[PDB]
Every structure is written in C-alpha cells, then in structure tokens.
C-alpha cells in the first residue's frame, strides 16, 4: 500500500535548538545531539490524511497552485513537478494581495495574456528596440506570473512547502476560509496550519522525497499512473 519506511533514510534534523513547545506533541524522547527525531506512526498518519484530502480535491477537479522561494533545489524541483503535473507555480518571492485579492493580479494576468496574443499575431509588426523591450517585459511578467496563468477563479487548494519563510502566504490563506496543507517543519505555529505534515524540509534530502510523494498523490487525477510509494527502487540525490 502506502507509507514505506526503509527508503526514507533522512527525515529529521533541524537548526540549532530553536524548536517551539507547540511541536512537543511530535517530540516524545529527549535528544542530546542538538537535533530532533519524529515518530514514524504520526507521520504515516499525516501522510494518509494528506493523501485523502488531495484525492478529495482531485475528485473536485479544481485548480492548484504551488509556491516556493527558498533554496533553488526546491525551486527547480517544483518546476519539474509543474512539468510533470499540470499546475501553476511561482519561482520567486511570494506576492502579497494574491489570495486575499484576485482582481489586483487578475488584471495583470490578463495583461500578460494580451502580450501573449500580441506576440502570437506580431512577427514583423514592430521595430527593433521595442521588440527587445517587449520581450524583456514578457520575461519580467513571467518571472512572477508565468506559472500562474491557468487560474480564472480563486483557487480551491494550495500547499505550503515551508511554513516559516512563506508565513505571508499561510497568513493570507488563513484569512480566507479555503484550506491549505503545509510541510510543517518543527517550531512553526500549528494554529495557522490545518493539515500538518511533520517531516524535515530545511534539508533537501527529505524535501525531494516529500514533494515526489505529494506529486504522486495528486497525479492520479489525470489517469496517469503514480511513480513512487509502490516502486522498490531508491530515489536519487545529488548535491555538492
């Protein structure tokens, strides 16, 4: 079934003793080596709950958005997931007024679409300097909006890869009544988050596996078979 253990070799570890007591429900023993260790039963239960909710929202057949701003490995990873799973994405700093307001950026997305259709029509209908300037404008617009172009209504569900650095996004999500799941690193506020995933995310060795698992969970909506959680082959990891 699900919730395999052996392959998931690195799932713990966190910055030097900055944990908050609100995560003490997940730290049963006492650790002497300036780190943390979770319990496998709780994280398997959280993974099952997350799988249930993502399959529910896949049966909803709505729209999903991913966000990410920390270390570029997660950025390129979620880019891959975006080109493995048809979903909007953001590769730069999260923009305020994105989920607490729609028109403010819907007009901008419509302007980007206008530029796209202009480029589709225009092949030799512009001068040299203006052509390069408009290409640069397209690049600047897609720097924040390139992934997020398939949304025509307020999104039904997103995820959070890091509750700490993107506290703005989780706060805006909590302002609205729509939910969101978060890869909850320890010391984060659990009251803001509605579905908690207690696993390491600061390190990439766990973030890649978690991202792949959630992509496989959401990939069933397309009648496109899953990749991991049932394959005995180990995942890849390369850093230097």
């Amino acid at each position: 079934s699900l919730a395999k253990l052996g392959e998931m070799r690195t799932h713990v570890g966190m910055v030097k003793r900055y944990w908050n007591p609100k995560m003490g429900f997940f730290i049963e023993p006492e650790r002497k080596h300036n780190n943390d260790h979770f319990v496998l039963e709780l994280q398997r239960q959280s993974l099952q709950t997350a799988y249930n909710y993502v399959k529910e929202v896949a049966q909803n057949n709505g729209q999903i958005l991913f966000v990410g701003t920390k270390n570029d490995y997660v950025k390129k990873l979620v880019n891959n997931i975006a080109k493995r799973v048809d979903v909007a994405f953001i590769t730069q700093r999260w923009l305020g007024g994105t989920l607490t307001n729609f028109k403010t950026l819907s007009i901008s997305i419509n302007k980007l679409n206008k530029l796209v259709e202009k480029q589709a029509e225009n092949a030799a209908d512009l001068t040299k300097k203006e052509n390069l300037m408009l290409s640069r404008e397209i690049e600047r617009l897609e720097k924040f909006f390139g992934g997020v172009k398939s949304l025509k209504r307020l999104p039904n569900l997103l995820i959070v890869d890091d509750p700490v650095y993107e506290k703005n996004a989780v706060a805006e999500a909590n302002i609205l009544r729509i939910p969101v799941v978060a890869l909850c690193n320890t010391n984060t506020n659990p009251e803001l988050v509605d579905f908690i995933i207690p696993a390491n995310n600061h390190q990439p060795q766990s973030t890649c596996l978690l991202m792949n698992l959630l992509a496989d969970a959401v990939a069933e909506a397309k009648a496109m078979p899953t990749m991991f959680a049932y394959k005995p082959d180990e995942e890849i990891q390369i850093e230097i």
Binding site: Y53, E56, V57, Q59, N60
Partner: peptide
Amino acid sequence: MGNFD
C-alpha cells in the same frame, strides 16, 4: 467540512 463533493 470534508464534504465538498
């Protein structure tokens, strides 16, 4: 509310 379906 877990029952949007």
